[PDB]
Design an enzyme around this catalytic site. Structure first.
Site, PDB file in Angstrom:
ATOM      1  N   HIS A 145      43.891  35.529  35.488  1.00 17.06           N
ATOM      2  CA  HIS A 145      43.346  37.043  34.735  1.00 17.06           C
ATOM      3  C   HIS A 145      44.573  38.093  34.462  1.00 17.06           C
ATOM      4  O   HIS A 145      44.470  39.053  33.701  1.00 17.06           O
ATOM      5  CB  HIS A 145      42.214  37.471  35.131  1.00 17.06           C
ATOM      6  CG  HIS A 145      42.255  38.309  36.525  1.00 17.06           C
ATOM      7  ND1 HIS A 145      43.138  39.138  36.838  1.00 17.06           N
ATOM      8  CD2 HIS A 145      41.608  38.102  37.903  1.00 17.06           C
ATOM      9  CE1 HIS A 145      43.199  39.620  38.168  1.00 17.06           C
ATOM     10  NE2 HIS A 145      42.075  38.902  38.844  1.00 17.06           N
ATOM     11  N   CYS A 203      44.705  42.028  43.807  1.00 14.20           N
ATOM     12  CA  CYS A 203      44.484  40.477  43.272  1.00 14.20           C
ATOM     13  C   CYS A 203      45.820  39.791  43.249  1.00 14.20           C
ATOM     14  O   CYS A 203      46.988  40.139  43.506  1.00 14.20           O
ATOM     15  CB  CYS A 203      44.021  40.486  41.558  1.00 14.20           C
ATOM     16  SG  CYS A 203      42.486  41.339  41.602  1.00 14.20           S
ATOM     17  N   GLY A 256      45.439  46.436  42.430  1.00 15.06           N
ATOM     18  CA  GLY A 256      46.592  45.912  42.786  1.00 15.06           C
ATOM     19  C   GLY A 256      46.594  44.690  43.650  1.00 15.06           C
ATOM     20  O   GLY A 256      47.641  44.026  44.010  1.00 15.06           O
TER      21      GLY A 256
HETATM   22  O1  RA7 Z   1      41.380  50.755  38.583  1.00 16.00           O
HETATM   23  C1  RA7 Z   1      40.215  49.651  38.625  1.00 16.00           C
HETATM   24  C2  RA7 Z   1      39.792  48.909  39.870  1.00 16.00           C
HETATM   25  C3  RA7 Z   1      39.413  49.349  40.993  1.00 16.00           C
HETATM   26  N1  RA7 Z   1      39.697  48.534  42.012  1.00 16.00           N
HETATM   27  C4  RA7 Z   1      39.889  47.256  41.796  1.00 16.00           C
HETATM   28  N2  RA7 Z   1      39.805  46.126  42.612  1.00 16.00           N
HETATM   29  C5  RA7 Z   1      39.143  46.093  43.970  1.00 16.00           C
HETATM   30  C6  RA7 Z   1      39.005  44.907  44.581  1.00 16.00           C
HETATM   31  O2  RA7 Z   1      39.852  44.054  44.478  1.00 16.00           O
HETATM   32  C7  RA7 Z   1      40.213  43.662  42.966  1.00 16.00           C
HETATM   33  C8  RA7 Z   1      39.922  44.843  42.166  1.00 16.00           C
HETATM   34  S1  RA7 Z   1      40.015  47.263  39.859  1.00 16.00           S
END
Ligand code: RA7
Ligand code: CL
Ligand code: CL
Lengths: 301, 301
Positions: free
Chosen positions: B41, B145, B143
């Protein structure tokens, strides 16, 4: 987004762990520049441990009495001295994996990561607080002695703990890296007990802020309170007193959430009096006190 | 003694973490030999989130669209392929810090360590279990991921998890290192929700055996149960069914403590009925289900 008891990444410290042997006793040492640090009790027979004279036992020793193993390499010991309860073994080789580091002494209520070791072989990493009674609630078996506690600030490792002994109650006692004990403990086989512990109030409040940030909001209420009214409750429940400084350190979390510390003290007051009314907070049925305000801010922002 | 949620030392995984950028999207990659593994992704934009056609988005990419960064060193991408939900970037340098490693797919109830990472910089380490509903209760911010889950048995790193997304309830979903999701989840921002979660019964029993090994006996009783009667009770509290497999796995902890598996099961049924009456087991006021039978021996005897 979630909240977990999180250790610092341990790689900078794994690079420093060695096995130290003196007679029968093998345990863990910390190899930084050309010195190996370990507990001075490595020199003691079981019989020595009852009433040791370290001064006398150490002059009786020589360099060759010390086997230092960095993985599958023997280090040559070229000197030995003692600083308080820590043995310093000078070696012929500077650790090429020495990180940026300093020796720091931590205050009760402050947290650090522990790399638990076994024959200079790192096996696990966990986060823990220096208790108000100067113990830590570790997980150690035999061979863990000389296992080390640390924080990481940018690239700099701050070493703050070396494991020396287990107390009867299952709690652990040790020194800073200058060999000064945390707490009223001695490195001799004698009767020693953990003092009655207290709850780290500022850390419980930090953890309530972590809960709110994660959408666990049920314990919140319309009320507020005073340091003095709160501290008479705290003192009653074996909670450390909350100081004006603790309130100032929780500042950022109080802003980010809209709940001021004495606002949140009112919630904690009610939790102390009334309990959790059979609920959980961040998947705990206890009030967690091993996260600092800094820990909550690091993990959540 | 002591019983702690202990993570594996993270150093061998730290030397493998890099930053992968594609378009305006930055996340973590795992650098092993001459391959960087990351979530596919990374190649999505805004309007690619609901129904990405990954085969179409990737055919339009050249190697130079991917900026890979190990500390300050840029790695040159010389190839790319997709395997299920994992992107594989071939690079011109093999990672000199590559440890002994393997890829394993774990089953619900299994534990691992997570190295949470941002911009390819490791930030912390914690212990997780794969829940029965195929999610993990992690601590992950934007961040994170491409953060990985791992075990380390005898210097060999077994990679079992790569972080892809957070579901609406605040729990986490990802893949094995062959790109296959745990559970019914997909790498699309279409509405998805985890199955109702259950307690990992086999792990709770292992943890009661650990409490008995560490000297806790207050929750034992003179009762036994049939396996079938135990499951009819345990499922009314959202506990996973205990199988004959689970009974066989506890055999060694049974033999160690001299308490039969179905005797310990009678104790669990009583704890679910009564709760803990202001007491704790190994420092918890809840029944803990994130220690496996294998973990209980790694940390006990
Ligand atoms: O800014 C939008 C987002 C906030 N938290 C995210 N994460 C949380 C868990 O790990 C992957 C996605 S994306
Ligand atoms: Cl002395
Ligand atoms: Cl498994």
């Amino acid at each position: 987004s979630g909240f977990r008891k999180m250790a610092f990444p341990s790689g900078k410290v794994e690079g420093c762990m060695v096995q130290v042997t003196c007679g029968t006793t093998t345990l863990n040492g910390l190899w930084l520049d050309d010195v190996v640090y370990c507990p001075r009790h490595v020199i003691c027979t079981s019989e020595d441990m009852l009433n040791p004279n370290y001064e006398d036992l150490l002059i009786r020793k020589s360099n060759h009495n010390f086997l230092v193993q960095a993985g599958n390499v023997q280090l040559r010991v070229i000197g030995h001295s003692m600083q308080n309860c820590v043995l310093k073994l000078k070696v012929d080789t500077a650790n090429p994996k020495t990180p940026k580091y300093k020796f720091v002494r931590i205050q009760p209520g402050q947290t650090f990561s522990v790399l638990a070791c076994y024959n200079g072989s790192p096996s696990g990493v966990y986060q823990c607080a220096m208790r108000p009674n100067f113990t830590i609630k570790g997980s150690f078996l035999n061979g863990s002695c000389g296992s080390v506690g640390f924080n990481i600030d940018y690239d700099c490792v701050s070493f703050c703990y070396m494991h020396h002994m287990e107390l009867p109650t299952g709690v652990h006692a040790g020194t800073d890296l200058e060999g000064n004990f945390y707490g009223p403990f001695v490195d001799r086989q004698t009767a020693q007990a953990a003092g009655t512990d207290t709850t780290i109030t500022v850390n419980v409040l930090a953890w309530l802020y972590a809960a709110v940030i994660n959408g666990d909001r049920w314990f919140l209420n319309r009320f507020t309170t005073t340091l003095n009214d709160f501290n008479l409750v705290a003192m009653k429940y074996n909670y450390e007193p909350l100081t004006q400084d603790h309130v100032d350190i929780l500042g950022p979390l109080s802003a980010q959430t809209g709940i001021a510390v004495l606002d949140m003290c009112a919630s904690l007051k009610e939790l102390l009096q009334n309990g959790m009314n059979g609920r959980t907070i961040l998947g705990s049925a206890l009030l967690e006190d091993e996260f600092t305000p800094f820990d909550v801010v690091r993990q959540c922002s």
